[PDB]
């Protein structure tokens, strides 16, 4: 019935966005499911998955068809957090071009710069800083991105950017 049809379609769109299969994304996307959610996992949208799994053209396709650049998963992450976590520079630059909030905060008040700093993503850190990421922001535990950084190159980068 229409209900199970919608369920099958949502799941197939999320899978296609994770795998980067643009032909399936084009076929299955609708204005009603563009921001559908992986309810069995992190409640990610197709754009979260395209960002996290480094599928740039699927990501821009989703953005060009109304994907919410500031949609939050169950932890408060927006897709820029996923790109920051895994170091996907071109994805992050695209999300910034589509007016994402560079200093967005998740449920623990981590910003994308906290995420890139903790995960060792040096060029992503530099990109975020060049677009106004604030290295003085503390998460809920009181930690700046520098406090989370363990790599020499990222620590040097953040120390330079901080007052």
């Amino acid at each position: 019935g229409p209900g199970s049809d919608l369920l099958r379609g949502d799941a197939a769109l999320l899978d296609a966005a994770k795998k980067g299969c643009l032909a399936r994304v084009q076929k299955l996307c609708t204005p009603e499911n563009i921001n559908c959610r992986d309810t069995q996992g992190r409640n990610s949208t197709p754009l979260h998955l395209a960002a996290g799994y480094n599928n740039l053209e699927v990501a821009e396709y989703l953005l060009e068809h109304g994907a919410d650049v500031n949609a939050q998963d169950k932890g408060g992450l927006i897709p820029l957090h996923n790109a920051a976590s895994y170091g996907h520079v071109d994805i992050a630059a695209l999300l910034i071009k589509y007016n994402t909030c560079v200093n967005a905060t998740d449920k623990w008040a981590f910003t994308p710069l906290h995420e890139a700093a903790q995960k060792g993503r040096t060029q992503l850190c530099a990109l975020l800083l060049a677009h106004g990421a604030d290295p003085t922001m503390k998460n809920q535990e009181g930690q700046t991105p520098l406090d989370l950084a363990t790599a020499d190159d990222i620590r040097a980068l953040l120390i330079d950017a901080m007052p």
């Binding site: 996992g41 992190r42 998955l49 996290g52 799994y53 957090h81 976590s85 895994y86 995420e115 809920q140």
Partner: peptide, 10 residues
């Protein structure tokens, strides 16, 4: 914090 789990991606 401790409950924080990884973002979707690779």
């Amino acid at each position: 914090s401790l409950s924080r789990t990884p973002a979707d991606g690779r």
